[PDB]
Ligand binder design. Structure first.
Ligand SMILES: CCCCCCCCCCCCCCCCCC(=O)OC[C@H](COP(=O)([O-])OCC(O)COP(=O)([O-])OC[C@@H](COC(=O)CCCCCCCCCCCCCCCCC)OC(=O)CCCCCCCCCCCCCCCCC)OC(=O)CCCCCCCCCCCCCCCCC
Ligand SMILES: CCCCCCCCCCCCCCCCCC(=O)OC[C@H](COP(=O)([O-])OCC(O)COP(=O)([O-])OC[C@@H](COC(=O)CCCCCCCCCCCCCCCCC)OC(=O)CCCCCCCCCCCCCCCCC)OC(=O)CCCCCCCCCCCCCCCCC
Ligand SMILES: CCCCCCCCCCCCCCCCCC(=O)OC[C@H](COP(=O)([O-])OCC(O)COP(=O)([O-])OC[C@@H](COC(=O)CCCCCCCCCCCCCCCCC)OC(=O)CCCCCCCCCCCCCCCCC)OC(=O)CCCCCCCCCCCCCCCCC
Ligand SMILES: CCCCCCCCCCCCCCCCC[C@@H](O)O[C@H](CO[C@H](O)CCCCCCCCCCCCCCC)COP(=O)(O)OCC[N+](C)(C)C
Ligand SMILES: CCCCCCCCCCCCCCCCC[C@@H](O)O[C@H](CO[C@H](O)CCCCCCCCCCCCCCC)COP(=O)(O)OCC[N+](C)(C)C
Ligand SMILES: CCCCCCCCCCCCCCCCC[C@@H](O)O[C@H](CO[C@H](O)CCCCCCCCCCCCCCC)COP(=O)(O)OCC[N+](C)(C)C
Ligand SMILES: CCCCCCCC/C=C\CCCCCCCC(=O)OC[C@H](COP(=O)(O)OCCN)OC(=O)CCCCCCC/C=C\CCCCCCCC
Ligand SMILES: CCCCCCCC/C=C\CCCCCCCC(=O)O[C@H](COC(=O)CCCCCCC/C=C/CCCCCCCC)COP(=O)(O)OCCN
Lengths: 83, 115, 175, 122, 105, 71, 98, 347, 171
């Protein structure tokens, strides 16, 4: 409580560069685990179509696969437009 | 193909400048003019004698720290992977180990030049 | 057959290796290794390895600067040797040059297995792939996969680097 | 060069597969176990001798621990060795059964119809 | 010698990198993916001694894909015959093989 | 569309090479025209030399080093 | 095999020969070691690029990393040798015999 | 050196060896070798002197050349087959390169020259580590690729190792050089049977490691590095000299001691493959190792050499540091012949 | 090792699409909206047969559908489309974001004259299903018969007969 206060004061008086560096590194380590937009970053990465989407051979038992891109089925990037 | 032409052009221009500088003016070379310079006097020893390096340990550490650059340069492309958590963990771990190496050499007086 | 640019580059690579392997003063050996690094970078660039060639060139440039400093510190003599100031150095240089000449002649004039196997040459361009797709570079993706696929490699590499720092500090202590 | 390490269904680092429980365990009075205990006792005596202690009577708890540890490890070593020999015999018999053409049964003649050469000693 | 810790624990420390036909990023395929797949599926579970003999065709095809020695030999033979026939003037290359072709997309 | 065009172009180049090889190599006694070097009968992606073997050096250069050298 | 592969393998052979035949300076042998590493890098890079082995593209970089370690190791030893003798000549390292 | 730094270095050496052991990828095996060398160089130089520096330099040069040849073999194997798994090499040239690299790492003849020098230049603890733990990784790699071994080259190197170990040991008065030549001969024995039965190789390695550990611990306990220094031990610790004589007899392969078990097994295994001339020559050659072991025993425990007056002072002091595994190591080095069939547990 | 069979040059003839890359990029969104079915059938044939020689008719159908699409565009309004693709063609990267007025005009024209709706972001990259009468290939890899495995390990484990049988040892 007071020991850490005196140590931090001495460090800020003598080595401000090291204090700033350690603070920045600690924030960089800690903050990503508490952010709600990391999931958004992952989903943005998954949403980029680098390669061709190969169609599946219809067998009559896929209610959740579209037969046309404009069909309502499949993933939607409506969330991405407002983000 | 274009870069080869550019490199050839630049080297050719520099070499032509050297050739002009060495063949255009009048040259009068004698032993006193071409002697080594030590501000008024003949050097006592040779310039090929050993010259001590007081920062040799930092020079060696530079070799190891130069490969962290190789390991860290593909980070912009690595940031595009789907499993961002693993990539971020590995990048932060690598930088943490680099910082720990720097701290270890700093605290063991490895950054101080030899006396 | 097509301008044999890669063959010329690899020949200059071998010539630089002969230059620094005949072992003149380490200044000229470092110069030869720098030349070989640049030319090998060019070869890898011609085969599509932009990042790898540029990185190897950068790494060897830094290493050779350190080597130059160390040569001036503890690897000098009154009269540093060049490739023509010594019978031994000149002999090794010439022997390497004619050995490369003989290997090349036995390669492109006939099919003969020197050590491992034989071949005809024909230039590298034949053995390409004509792959036509992509909005990225496969080399960059494979290198960037180190942070998602190669976790084990990253762990062992970082450990070895930290241990190497500790090791050089332990070795140069003296006492 | 490596006979049994590539056997199908081999768990890497078990030291004692489950099937080894189908075999009879070695008896606790196994002479090999007694020899293991004797080795532990010799180790204890040498430990007393090196440290410059009364060889036969210095540390009784230490000798007891030596003997117990040697017997404990030897029991499982004997179990594994027995299991490995049983595996070798099982595989050999199965291979002989599955290849009758390589291990044929040929009728045996009696010594009255087999002509053996006689070499006089003189 | 080889303590298979990976197999005992199911870790995959380095098996992701052992072969060319194993889950590259972005599904980028190897140049010889099909040949290696065929050879690996031929040789799986029968041991090295049997795989050396009974899967020699697949391995020969895989090596031909890797190094293309036979294809280069055939191309060299064809070109040598073409040059021999052209020096004596019995053969003439077609216009589409001389730079006067009609290109298509 | 690019895929369909690529298949048609590759197949046309290979057929032209096949016809030229058939004309050229008629004198060699034990030569089969169009004989594969693979035991497998499945399709194999053509190598650069197969497509551009009997063509000019400029086409070969554009096919091999055209993209890399473009800056 | 292309003639480039033969040239790279010959470069490795030349570097190995240069390392195995010692002149006075130890720095020259260290440079031969570095050249051997460079030739290995080039050879592996060419093979991996030609075969389009994507995940193996990170293999050469790892090579470089350990090359650096080896280089550093050698230089460290050289320093100590010089500190003992004022020279990096290998003929001073003869206190031990067979 | 700081104790924590030394512990970290030893752990790095051991973890590099284990990385070699557990890897399925050639690059990871090479990485393990590199890490082992990197961490092992400082350990040889813990006690600083010119001799230790020279030994470290020679060791580094030899091992770096071996590593470069190792990588070249790997890359050629990859070129002739797009494989990274350590199963069996697909090119004979790559196999020759790998065999030579691993022989140079192990110190087999004619790559044996560095072993006596490096062992003489370092302390007894560093020598113990170098001659016991440093043999595991190359032997494990050789065991994994045994079916691709060219028997002629491997057997030639093994026979050369046995002969040269005996002849070199015949001429030594320093104990570290004697141990190094014994190591060379035993490594030749280990690699002679490798193309036939890797279990025999593992058994030979285990027995040799046990006897070498016992020998080096007895040499550390009686802090002697020369024959004449060891001639003084009887006047201070006779039990140590007696145990050392028995251990030396075991190292000579005399029945019914433990050292007889490996050679015996190796010999019989070789006779299963219609190899008769070579085992006979190997045993008749190991007679030389037995001879110089008996010379050391004569000078150390069977006769009493003259001593010095100052020794009386040493009579008044005990050893402050005790080695906990020395008695067990001695017992395993001598009395384990009746437990010979247990080798089936090794396969 | 067999003869490689190749289609004749007459078989490979088709009515080609001779519009440049800028025109194609300008039309691409509506082209993928309208000509999806032949394109997807061709791509399924391509990825299931692993042989360009087995999907030539599907490629010709793709060409026909593209030509019909471009004929419709030419017939209804070619001037807004020409302005749009010229604006696209000026850019060295062919960026969409520099031509939004011309894109708006072209989109309005196609919407009013043909009822064509531009697909929203994320739609053209979906994985869709294709109904085809083409039989599923049974051996697209032309695989040989796999060699038989080693039989099995079976039976109850019994103690070794007369122990280890190593020299004089009875156990
Ligand atoms: C307290 C002691 C106690 O518990 O007694 C119970 C126990 C009763 O055991 P048992 O099963 O009723 O004895 C059956 C018969 O002895 C019949 O004995 P066995 O046929 O069961 O023999 C067991 C077998 C397995 O035994 C062994 O492997 C080793 C046993 C002792 C080795 C002898 C060397 C030094 C002692 O022995 C051998 O195969 C002979 C190998 C001996 C040669 C050793 C090689 C180098 C010789 C160097 C001199 O007594 C002993 O164990 C005997 C003392 C040992
Ligand atoms: C094959 C079948 C089975 C055979 C068994 C195997 C062989 C025997 C066992 C081997 C291991 C056991 C003993 C080794 C550790 C002993 C350490 C020692 O130094 O001894 C001193 C110690 C006497 O010292 P102390 O009492 O403290 O006071 C005197 C001072 O210390 C004053 O002493 P100091 O230290 O001042 O005297 C100086 C002396 C100190 O030097 C020595 O004492 C020599 C010690 C050599 C250690 C042995 C090597 C390790 C084991 C390998 C054995 C190889 C066997 C294969 C054949 C090759 C033979 C070499 O140095 C010299 O004089 C230079 C002599 C150099 C001549 C060269 C010969 C040396 C090597 C010969 C070894 C022979 C084999 C061991 C025989 C037993 C020896 C105790 O001796 C003993 O009392 C232990 C003997 C055993 C007693 C326990 C028996 C159990 C009790 C009876 C119960 C009945 C059981 C059954 C129950 C039935 C129901 C009723
Ligand atoms: C099985 C195959 C056959 C057997 C194996 C081969 C046998 C050869 C073994 C040679 C061992 C050499 C040795 O330790 O000393 C020789 C020693 C002679 O020593 P000495 O003459 O008495 O005096 C030396 C003093 O130590 C003078 O030095 P000091 O004054 O500085 O004392 C320091 C002392 C006092 O220690 C301390 O101060 C404690 C303080 C703790 C510091 C905390 C540091 C932790 C942070 C670092 C973390 C690094 C992790 C690595 C991560 C890698 C990532 C890739 O520590 C030590 O003495 C050395 C500690 C040894 C470390 C053992 C830990 C196990 C390593 C496991 C590594 C595997 C990792 C996973 C691998 C996965 C693959 C990647 O020999 C013996 O005493 C008996 C030999 C016993 C050998 C084993 C016996 C048979 C097997 C059971
Ligand atoms: C900015 C980048 C673009 C630059 C483009 C121009 C590049 C110029 C490169 C260098 C030229 C500048 C030098 C100035 C004139 C050249 C003079 C010199 O090079 O040649 C002289 C020629 O000397 C020769 O040794 C003798 C001439 C005989 C040899 C010529 C061979 C063929 C001639 C045979 C006659 C038949 C005609 C054949 C040709 C059609 C040697 O003079 P020298 O005194 O040493 O040096 C000092 C020169 N000074 C006096 C000006 C200071
Ligand atoms: C048995 C005793 C355990 C403790 C001691 C172990 C000693 C060895 C050191 C650490 C063991 C290594 C185990 C980690 C192996 C990495 C692979 C595994 O963990 O999965 C990773 C999971 O990620 C984890 O976060 C791994 C990071 C944990 C390690 C970082 C710090 C630990 C290092 C400690 C020792 C290193 C040296 C000392 C440092 C101070 C990545 O998987 P994932 O990305 O899902 O999917 C990949 C497959 N894809 C590509 C198809 C998608
Ligand atoms: C001097 C005599 C030798 C002494 C040897 C040291 C004794 C102490 C060692 C401590 C005991 C623990 C060791 C292992 C216990 C559990 C580990 C277990 O999982 O490992 C198994 C393996 O079990 C062990 O290897 C058995 C170790 C037993 C060693 C003793 C045999 C000695 C021979 C006869 C001498 C008599 C010894 C007397 C002992 C006091 C896994 O098998 P596997 O991963 O598939 O094989 C790898 C090698 N392959 C594939 C190439 C075959
Ligand atoms: C990058 C920026 C600069 C680029 C470099 C080009 C510089 C252009 C300079 C043009 C100016 C003309 C140069 C004249 C100076 C030449 C040197 C000089 O003075 O020599 C004098 C010398 C004296 O000789 P002697 O009297 O016989 O002997 C007395 C000693 N015993 O007289 C001469 O040699 C005459 C030489 C004629 C000069 C050449 C003129 C042609 C200029 C071409 C320039 C080329 C540009 C490219
Ligand atoms: C959890 C974060 C970890 C990752 C982030 C770090 C990124 C990189 C930063 C570390 C780089 C290496 C640091 C090495 C530290 C060496 C310390 C040292 O020994 O230096 C001392 C100087 O520093 C010291 O006195 C010792 C340490 C002083 C404290 C330094 C910071 C400690 C932590 C404070 C910050 C805490 C976090 C911020 C919180 C914000 C407050 C609310 C000696 O200086 P000389 O140059 O030799 O002096 C010559 C002239 N007189």
């Amino acid at each position: 409580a007071g020991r850490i206060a005196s140590f931090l004061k001495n460090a800020w008086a003598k080595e401000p560069v090291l204090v700033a560096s350690f603070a920045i590194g600690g924030l960089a380590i800690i903050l990503p685990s508490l952010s709600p937009y990391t999931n958004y970053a992952i989903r943005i990465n998954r949403a980029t179509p680098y390669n061709y989407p190969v169609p599946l051979r219809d067998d009559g038992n896929m209610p959740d696969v579209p037969s046309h891109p404009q069909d309502p089925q499949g993933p939607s990037l409506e969330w991405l437009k407002n983000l | 193909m274009n870069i080869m032409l550019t490199l050839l052009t630049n080297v050719t221009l520099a070499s032509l400048l050297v050739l002009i500088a060495f063949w255009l003016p009048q040259l009068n070379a004698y032993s006193e003019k071409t002697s080594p310079y030590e501000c008024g006097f003949d050097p006592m020893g040779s310039a090929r004698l050993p010259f001590s390096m007081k920062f040799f340990l930092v020079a060696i550490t530079f070799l190891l720290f130069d490969l962290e650059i190789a390991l860290l340069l593909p980070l912009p492309w690595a940031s595009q992977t789907n499993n961002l958590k693993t990539m971020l963990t590995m990048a932060l771990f690598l930088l943490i180990l680099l910082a720990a190496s720097l701290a270890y050499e700093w605290t063991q007086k490895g950054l101080e030049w030899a006396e | 057959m097509t301008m044999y640019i890669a063959f010329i580059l690899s020949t200059i690579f071998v010539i630089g290796f002969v230059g620094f392997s005949s072992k003149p003063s380490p200044i000229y050996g470092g110069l030869g290794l720098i030349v070989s690094g640049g030319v090998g970078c060019g070869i890898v660039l011609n085969f599509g390895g932009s990042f790898l060639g540029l990185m190897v060139f950068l790494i060897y440039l830094g290493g050779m600067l350190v080597v130059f400093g160390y040569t001036t510190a503890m690897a000098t003599e009154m009269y540093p040797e060049v490739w023509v100031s010594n019978k031994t150095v000149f002999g090794a240089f010439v022997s390497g040059l004619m050995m490369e000449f003989c290997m090349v002649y036995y390669a492109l004039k006939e099919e003969e297995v020197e050590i491992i196997f034989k071949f005809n040459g024909l230039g590298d361009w034949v053995i390409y792939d004509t792959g036509d797709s992509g909005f990225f570079s496969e080399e960059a993706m494979g290198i960037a996969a180190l942070y998602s696929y190669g976790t084990w490699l990253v762990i062992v590499t970082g450990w070895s680097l930290l241990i190497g720092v500790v090791v050089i500090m332990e070795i140069t202590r003296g006492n | 060069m490596t006979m049994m390490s590539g056997r199908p269904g081999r768990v890497p680092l078990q030291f004692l597969p489950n099937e080894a429980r189908s075999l009879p365990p070695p008896k606790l009075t196994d002479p090999r176990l007694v020899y293991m205990g004797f080795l532990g006792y010799c180790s204890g005596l040498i430990d007393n001798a090196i440290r410059r202690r009364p060889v036969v009577s210095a540390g009784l708890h230490r000798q007891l621990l030596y003997v117990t540890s040697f017997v404990f490890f030897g029991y499982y070593l004997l179990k594994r060795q027995d299991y490995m020999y049983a595996l070798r015999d099982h595989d050999m018999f199965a291979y002989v059964k599955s290849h009758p053409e390589d291990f044929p049964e040929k009728d045996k003649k009696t010594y009255g119809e087999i002509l053996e050469e006689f070499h006089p000693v003189r | 010698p080889f303590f298979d810790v990976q197999k005992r624990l199911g870790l995959d420390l380095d098996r992701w990198m052992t072969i060319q036909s194993a889950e590259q990023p972005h599904k980028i395929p190897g140049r010889c993916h099909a040949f290696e797949k065929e050879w690996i599926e031929c040789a799986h579970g029968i041991g090295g001694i049997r795989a050396e003999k009974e899967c020699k065709i697949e391995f020969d095809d895989f090596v031909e894909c890797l190094l293309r020695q036979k294809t280069m030999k055939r191309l060299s033979a064809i070109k040598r015959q073409r040059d021999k026939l052209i020096k004596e003037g019995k053969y003439t290359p077609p216009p589409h093989h001389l730079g006067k072709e009609d290109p298509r997309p | 569309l690019f895929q369909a065009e690529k298949d048609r172009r590759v197949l046309q180049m290979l057929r032209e090479n096949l016809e030229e090889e058939a004309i050229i190599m008629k004198d060699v006694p034990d030569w089969k025209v169009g004989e594969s070097v693979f035991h497998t009968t499945r399709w194999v992606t053509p190598m650069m030399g197969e497509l551009y073997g009997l063509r000019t050096n400029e086409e070969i250069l554009s096919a091999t080093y055209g993209f890399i050298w473009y800056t | 095999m292309p003639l480039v592969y033969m040239n790279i393998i010959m470069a490795f052979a030349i570097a190995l020969a240069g390392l195995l035949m010692y002149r006075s300076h130890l720095m020259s042998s260290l440079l031969c070691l570095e050249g051997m590493m460079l030739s290995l890098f080039i050879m592996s890079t060419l093979i991996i690029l030609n075969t389009h082995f994507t995940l193996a593209n990170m293999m050469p970089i790892i090579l470089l990393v350990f090359a650096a370690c080896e280089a550093a190791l050698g230089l460290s030893l050289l320093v100590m040798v010089s500190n003992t003798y004022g020279t990096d000549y290998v003929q001073n390292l003869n206190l031990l015999q067979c | 050196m700081n104790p924590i730094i030394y512990t970290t270095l030893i752990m790095t050496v051991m973890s590099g060896t284990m990385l070699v052991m557990i890897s399925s990828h050639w690059l990871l095996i090479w990485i393990g070798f590199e890490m082992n060398l990197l961490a092992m160089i400082p350990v040889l130089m813990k006690n600083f002197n010119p001799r230790a520096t020279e030994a470290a330099t020679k060791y580094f040069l030899t091992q770096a050349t071996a590593s470069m040849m190792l990588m070249m073999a790997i890359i050629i194997n990859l070129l002739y087959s797009g494989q990274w798994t350590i199963t069996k090499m697909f090119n004979p040239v790559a196999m020759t390169m790998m065999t030579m690299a691993l022989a140079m790492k192990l110190g087999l003849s004619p790559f044996h020259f560095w072993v006596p020098e490096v062992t003489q230049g370092i302390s007894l603890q560093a020598g113990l580590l170098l001659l016991t733990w440093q043999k595991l990784a190359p032997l494990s790699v050789l065991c994994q690729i045994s079916q691709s071994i060219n028997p002629n080259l491997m057997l030639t190197m093994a026979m050369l190792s046995i002969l040269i170990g005996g002849w070199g040991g015949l001429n030594q008065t320093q104990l570290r050089k004697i141990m190094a030549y014994s190591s060379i001969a035993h490594m030749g024995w280990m690699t002679a049977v490798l193309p036939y039965n890797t279990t025999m190789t593992i058994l030979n390695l285990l027995i040799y490691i046990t006897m070498t550990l016992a020998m080096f611990m007895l040499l550390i306990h009686s802090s002697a590095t020369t024959t004449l220094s060891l001639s003084h031990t009887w006047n201070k610790m006779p039990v140590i000299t007696s145990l050392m004589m028995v251990t030396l007899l075991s190292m000579g392969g005399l029945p019914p001691l433990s050292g007889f078990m490996p050679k015996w097994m190796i010999i019989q295994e070789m006779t299963k493959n219609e190899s008769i001339i070579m085992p006979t020559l190997m045993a008749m050659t190991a007679l030389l190792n037995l001879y110089f072991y008996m010379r050391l025993a004569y000078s150390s425990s069977l006769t009493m050499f003259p001593s010095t007056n100052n020794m009386k002072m040493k009579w008044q002091f005990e050893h402050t540091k005790q080695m906990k595994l020395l008695p067990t190591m001695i017992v395993l080095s001598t009395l384990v012949l009746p437990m010979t069939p247990a080798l089936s547990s090794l396969n | 090792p067999g003869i490689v069979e190749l289609p004749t040059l007459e078989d490979l003839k088709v009515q080609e699409v001779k519009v440049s890359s800028s025109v194609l990029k300008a039309a691409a969104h509506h082209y993928g909206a309208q000509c999806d079915k032949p394109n997807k059938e061709f791509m399924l044939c391509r990825w299931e047969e692993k042989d360009p020689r087995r999907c030539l008719e599907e490629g010709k159908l793709v060409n026909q559908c593209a030509l019909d699409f471009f004929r419709q565009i030419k017939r209804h309004c070619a001037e807004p489309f020409t302005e749009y693709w010229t604006c696209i063609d000026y850019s060295g990267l062919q960026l969409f974001r520099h031509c939004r007025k011309q894109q708006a005009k072209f989109d309005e024209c196609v919407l009013d004259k043909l009822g064509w709706v531009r697909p929203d972001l994320g739609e053209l990259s979906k994985v869709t299903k294709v109904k085809t009468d083409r039989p599923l290939p049974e051996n697209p890899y032309h695989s040989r018969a796999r060699p038989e495995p080693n039989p099995e390990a079976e039976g109850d484990l019994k103690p070794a007969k007369h122990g280890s049988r190593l020299f004089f040892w009875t156990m």
